[PDB]
Write a structure and sequence with these properties.
Chain C: Belongs to the universal ribosomal protein uL4 family. The structure is cut from a larger assembly and holds chains A, B, C, D and E. Chain C is an alpha/beta fold. Chain C is built from five helices and eight strands, in the order ββααβαββββαβα. Chain C has a four-stranded parallel beta sheet. Chain C starts with 9 loop residues before the first strand and ends with a helix. The chains are: A alpha+beta, B mainly alpha, C alpha/beta, D mainly alpha, E mainly alpha. The structure holds five RNA strands.
RNA sequence: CUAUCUAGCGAAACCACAGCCAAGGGAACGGGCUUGGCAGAAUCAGCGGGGAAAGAAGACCCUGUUGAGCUUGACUCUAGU
RNA sequence: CGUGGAGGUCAGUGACGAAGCCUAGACCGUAAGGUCGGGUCGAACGGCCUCUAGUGCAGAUCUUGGUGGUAGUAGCAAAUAUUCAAAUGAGAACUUUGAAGACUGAAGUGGGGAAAGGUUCCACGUCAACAGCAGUUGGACGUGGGUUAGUCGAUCCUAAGAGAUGGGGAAGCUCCGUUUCAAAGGCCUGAUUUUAUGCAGGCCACCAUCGAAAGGGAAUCCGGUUAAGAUUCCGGAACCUGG
RNA sequence: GUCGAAUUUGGGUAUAGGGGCGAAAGACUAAUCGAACCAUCUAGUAGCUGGUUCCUGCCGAAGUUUCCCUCAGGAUAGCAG
RNA sequence: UUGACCUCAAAUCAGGUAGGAGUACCCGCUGAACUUAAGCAUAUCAAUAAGCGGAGGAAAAGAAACCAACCGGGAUUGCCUUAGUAACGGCGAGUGAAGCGGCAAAAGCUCAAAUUUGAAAUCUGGUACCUUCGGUGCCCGAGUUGUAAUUUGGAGAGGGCAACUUUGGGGCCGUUCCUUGUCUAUGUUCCUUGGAACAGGACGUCAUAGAGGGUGAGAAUCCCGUGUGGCGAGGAGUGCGGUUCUUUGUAAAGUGCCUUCGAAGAGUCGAGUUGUUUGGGAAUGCAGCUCUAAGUGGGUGGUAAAUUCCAUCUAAAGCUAAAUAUUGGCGAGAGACCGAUAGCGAACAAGUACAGUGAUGGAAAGAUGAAAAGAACUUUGAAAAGAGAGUGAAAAAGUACGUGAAAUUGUUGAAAGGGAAGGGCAUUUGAUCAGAC
RNA sequence: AAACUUUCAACAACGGAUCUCUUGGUUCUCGCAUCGAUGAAGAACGCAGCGAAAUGCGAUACGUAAUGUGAAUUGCAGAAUUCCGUGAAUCAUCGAAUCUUUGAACGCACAUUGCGCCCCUUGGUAUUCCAGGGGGCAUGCCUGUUUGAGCGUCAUUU
């Protein structure tokens, strides 16, 4: 049970906040857990995903398929992965959307701010 | 892309003026070559760059007159505070802290004494 | 207060072969000419609009609240009644169930849970865990989504970390002997709830 | 209209009485708001007890002349009798009534000894002194029933 | 009328710009519900009253 | 020129359920009830006997402690003078 | 008996199919109703003890929506009238072209405008809908193009009128009143060419303003030109006002 | 019928609801006039018309008294549960 | 002649300010009628709706020209209570207060009327500088028809005696409050069904975290959050807790006894009459007229008047938090509320489309699928489309899309039918069927 | 005997009920006090590479500047260096700005996109005429200033 007086247990507001969330806040919403190998190596459990990581699929029909993120389609609350597509009847390939909570990061895209984010959360590099 | 505002601050008013009329020319041939080709999203960058140049120009003359009117009353009305019509008309703290000697003497002599009650 | 009255409709009267209900005037919009103001009309005001002066709270004699709380307290020591409420107390050594005061000074939830199991609350706790269901009606999306049974009521005489030990344990409530809620001591007006007394709590009843 | 054997009733509901209807659904809400402002002031004035020493006063209106009750102020004769100035007493948690006049000695001396007991049990701190903490109580009416 | 004030011709230009069907690509947008132009007006059906 | 027949297009009023009579009785003038006469699919163009046909909660009459327009030495007032 | 919702309990049913819907299939109850089987469907829902109410429909010329018989019926008949052939097309009584026969008959079924409309104008493509038959056509649909002025108007004046101001009423939104018990305004010429206009002067007494695309009023004609504009463009030839 | 004028008519303008305008019909004042239209008071009041929703079980009437600006209504006694 | 005063002007003179919007809640002003009275006119709705003026975060009121008759109380506001009472009232219908007692909150007060006269000491504004919600220097002006100092009835002022006691401002760090940022646990282990596990079964882990939401189905442990704490950033100022600098001041306040005084408000109070208003009765307030005082005076003391007493306050002048109100604005938390004809008129490009000259009037309309994977390709057709093929868990999901009722309709099957049909009891016949063995 | 009519079933229609949902409404509680002549509310017209509307904005026009976060936006096209970054975003925040024409609306007007005057400057051989750019020109009222009017009035003269 929640103890704050500034926290709402309203289903209508929780649904509205997610669906009308701005893009900057959607970045935190689309966070992917790290792998067992990276979790012990960094000390972080989950991070906000970005475009250049490669993840692993642990749920859905695409389980066991590795691939590097192709786009973080924040409008659709989805993440696309290369080499994970469905080929249409007319020889055309379309990406299939994946939710990051069903993905497992296998190596982060290390930048200056992503590194700085690591020490901020207590990561050990 | 476009122009960087922090680069425009270094140049003087004469260099910005040339750049503004330089950008005005450039946007003019973009409009002329847009009517032939189907789409041209580059006109957006030039329009914003002109706006950035104009804005950085504006602050240079606006600060020039703040320093000209620095350290005196009667600032230009567009450079004063825009707090609120009611608040701007509101009495200052000096004019709201004026007190009569009859109360000034009483404040000095007899303030509320901080008292506790245990024993 | 105005819903179903925010128009200017009037009756057309007789001779026009239509019913004498007031009807929206004007023209050109499809809403005009239609019934208004009635408890039968679409878009009217519903019959006897709810007002809030309604009597929500009900005042109960002080002596009766004291009478009923003593009855639901005396009914906690009847294993026949506690079993009827389905509290899984077949393996309890004896009731009332009184434990040493050292339960009152437990901080971690995991310690408090294992304390209840060893005392005999294992079966009752698992019943709450496996009873979680969705609400049947429209109450799901009125912030009443899930439903479960109610487990043991732990009552203390002092609070040194016990109210927050069982704060996250489903079906478990923590209480003080001074307060002794009747809603907790006979849920659904059904007597005989399973209650764990501390040694200090049990002594304070006299 | 009039009917079976019933008392007459005067029910005053022929105005538009439906808009001037109060149902304080706030009874519990106002109570908590009172108890914050009651403590928020108590922090700001920290040592003081949130109220003035009020006197003991015999009620009017022979119906109630038989009991005694808290008054509004200390009847300048009283504050001068106990040896203190009104302008200063108002800074010491004494409520003084410039418009009440003493007329009964047994009532009169009761306020004097009330005010004398008050002076002994209070601690006034210097305007420039250390002002040690003194474990406030929140009511003079409680301390002097 | 032929002779007209600038208010009238200015407000007719507004009504001439707005007279065409829905852009085609808008119905291809994510979470789109607009199926056509519900404010389309023709000179033979309803009058502008300007 | 219609009506008529054809290709195309294509409504509305109205409709408890419906549609053969005689007499009877019956809310004192039945399509239905009783006793009789009778009674054969599906139908077309006409017709104005009937359906007390349709069109309107009778505008006449009366009732209502329901009105309004108007009048006057009605009652009670009032602008102006 | 049934319905929406609430407290309790059946550690109740359920994606191995909840709820709903359909079923001259079965069972229970006097009945309200309850239960089962089969089909369809896809995510929630019940038994029992209690609590609560925006809780049960055949009708109110009930409300909103939907649908019939009537019925392939009434009808699609005012305004003199069509016909032959070719072209196009899947398709021609209706489109285009030609021919023939007719009509409006100059207070026209012709050529221009005012009010009104607003793109209906013109080109290209095009017929799902609209043109109460049709449609290849259209004032429809989709996409575009098109309105060029010193001289034509407005713009100026005033009319019947409207209406600020100085004031006077009115609690007040506002009313009166347009020269009224107003210190009501501005033009010519000088003087100095530290020079702005102070200063020489005289003159003037009316008096805000709005109000007519048919009243009053400075001045442009011809020829040519576009798919669509012209007293406006082009060529030529003019006039007026101001400086 | 009238058809050179008490003629016809456009545009402007004035006159606004117990008010206008009327060669006078209670006519006209936006298909509305013997008091326009719009919103609000307003869910205006009705002794009058119409309707008023599930089952079974048990009981079971009245149209009569007196008073009432009382006679299509109430109060009252009686009948009923 | 020249220089003033009074009064009145002018200027695109220097600096400002009012307007308008919104208006739920407040302060006034104006003001109905519908209705009830079983009619109706006084009465009631109602001192209300509509109309007008004027504010705030609350407003307004507010420190007695009060209440009371007590053993007196002591600003105002609000609650409970007094009380459906005293009283009013075609004494009918009906209306209808306040004192007293408990609680919330509590806070007080200041102007006029006085010669500083051994000294306009005062205040605006202008200009220069400076540490600018401002200070200082200088200069016109306001101002003797009174601007500063001094005191407000509870007092107080001018003198005499005696002596004491008590004091201001500027920097710094914290604290308080507000806004805001960041960090802070535990499975995605195995088997089955399923398109998808978020389901069922086994085994665990965390819990001051089993609120809520998301992800392909009911997820404490997959994600965001949640719980408990930690660490930052920007703002308000004295509300205060410490550090420090200036000594304000040859100043101010309080206090005992004696003496002399003690100014306290006018076209105002008050009275008559009229009207309206009230619960206010031989007149509750208010306002109109006419009359219009006073100083041991005057106002009040709820039956008019004359006479004698007594009680309590100080008007014609003024400021003031909190307790109270709030369908408007902003930001939140909720519900035994409604669920697309319901709930606001409006879940959607709704005050929109649309109607009228106008003022105004005003809808309809949510749901494919987890994912468009929105049907490639062949074939018939002028085309729309059809038939195959395909996607999808499902086209009994094809943008006429969840499910998909009834009225009404087509096709197939069965049966009956001489001017209706439908119904009841009973059985024949045909079809179908449960039980029991 | 067909047809036709009627009844029922299956399948297919018409229609949009029911069932299950819900970024909506409604009601209650809590906290706060903040429009406008330094130009409000409102209105008109415009602005995107491709928008009619809604939403956003104003000729600097789905926006500029500043701060934070830190890699997207997305229907298509395009741009990539801006990706260990003084830096993407239809991001949040927002303290600097722009803010067309109006509007209490203010030079005079307004059913006109009508008509003047003043100040500085530029061009046409120009204080005067025409044009351009920039700044102005409403009313009531208060305080101050300056030029004044009145045998209203004092003093002083000659």
């Amino acid at each position: 049970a929640k103890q704050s007086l500034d926290v709402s247990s309203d289903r209508r507001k929780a649904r509205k906040a997610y669906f009308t969330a701005p893009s900057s806040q959607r970045r935190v919403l689309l966070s992917a857990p790290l792998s067992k190998e990276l979790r012990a190596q960094y000390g972080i459990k989950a991070l906000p995903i970005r475009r250049d990581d490669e993840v692993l699929v642990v749920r859905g029909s695409k389980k066991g398929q590795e691939g590097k993120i192709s786009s973080v389609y924040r409008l659709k609350f989805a993440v696309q992965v290369d080499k994970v597509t469905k080929e249409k009847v007319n020889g055309a390939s379309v990406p299939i959307n994946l939710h990051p909570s069903k993905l497992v990061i296998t190596k982060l895209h290390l930048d200056k701010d992503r590194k700085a984010l690591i020490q901020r959360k207590g990561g050990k590099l | 892309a476009g122009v960087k505002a922090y680069e425009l601050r270094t140049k003087s008013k004469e260099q910005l003026a040339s750049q503004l009329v330089d950008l005005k020319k450039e946007l003019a041939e973009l409009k002329v070559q847009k009517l032939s080709r189907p789409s041209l999203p580059k006109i957006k960058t030039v329009r914003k760059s002109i706006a950035c140049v104009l804005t950085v120009i504006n602050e240079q003359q606006r600060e020039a007159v703040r320093q000209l009117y620095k350290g005196k009353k009667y600032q230009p009305k567009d450079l004063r505070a825009k707090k609120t019509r009611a608040l701007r008309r509101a009495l200052t703290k000096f004019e709201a802290s004026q007190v009569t000697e009859k109360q000034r003497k009483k404040q000095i002599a007899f303030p509320q004494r901080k008292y506790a009650i245990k024993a | 207060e105005k819903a179903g009255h925010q128009t200017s409709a009037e009756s057309w009267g007789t001779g026009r072969a239509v019913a004498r209900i007031p009807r929206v005037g004007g023209g050109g919009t499809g809403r005009s000419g239609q019934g208004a103001f009635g408890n039968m009309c679409r878009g009217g005001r519903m019959f006897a609009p709810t007002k809030t002066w309604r009597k929500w709270n009900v005042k109960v004699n002080h002596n009766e609240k004291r009478y009923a709380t003593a009855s639901a307290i005396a009914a906690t020591a009847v294993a026949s009644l506690v079993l009827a409420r389905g509290h899984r107390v077949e393996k309890i050594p004896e009731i009332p169930l009184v434990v040493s005061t050292d339960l009152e000074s437990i901080q971690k939830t995991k310690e408090a849970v294992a304390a209840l199991k060893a005392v005999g609350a294992h079966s009752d706790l698992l019943k709450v865990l496996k009873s979680k269901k969705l609400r049947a009606g429209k109450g799901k999306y009125r912030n009443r989504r899930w439903t479960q049974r109610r487990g043991p009521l732990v009552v203390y005489a002092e609070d040194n970390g016990i109210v927050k030990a069982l704060r996250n344990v489903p079906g478990v409530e923590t209480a003080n002997v001074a307060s002794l809620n009747l809603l907790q001591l006979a849920p659904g007006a059904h007597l005989g709830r399973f209650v764990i007394w501390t040694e200090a709590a049990f002594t304070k009843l006299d | 209209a009039i009917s079976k054997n019933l008392p007459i009733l005067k029910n005053h509901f022929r105005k538009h009485w439906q808009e001037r209807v109060k149902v304080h659904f706030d009874q519990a809400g106002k109570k908590v708001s009172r108890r914050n402002a009651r403590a928020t002031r108590a922090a700001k004035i920290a040592p003081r007890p949130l109220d003035l020493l009020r006197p003991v006063v015999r009620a009017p209106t022979v119906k109630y002349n038989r009991k005694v009750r808290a008054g509004r102020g200390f009847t300048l004769a009283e504050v001068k009798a106990a040896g203190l100035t009104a302008a200063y007493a108002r800074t010491i948690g004494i409520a003084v009534d410039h418009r009440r006049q003493n007329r009964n000695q047994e009532i009169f001396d009761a306020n004097v000894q009330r005010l004398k007991e008050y002076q002994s049990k209070i601690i006034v701190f210097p305007r420039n002194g250390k002002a040690p903490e003194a474990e406030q109580v929140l009511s003079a009416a409680a301390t002097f029933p | 009328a032929a002779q007209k004030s600038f208010r009238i011709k200015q407000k007719m230009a507004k009504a001439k710009k707005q007279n065409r069907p829905l852009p085609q690509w808008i119905r291809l947008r994510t979470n789109n519900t607009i199926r056509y132009n519900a404010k389309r007006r023709n000179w033979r059906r309803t009058k502008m009253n300007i």
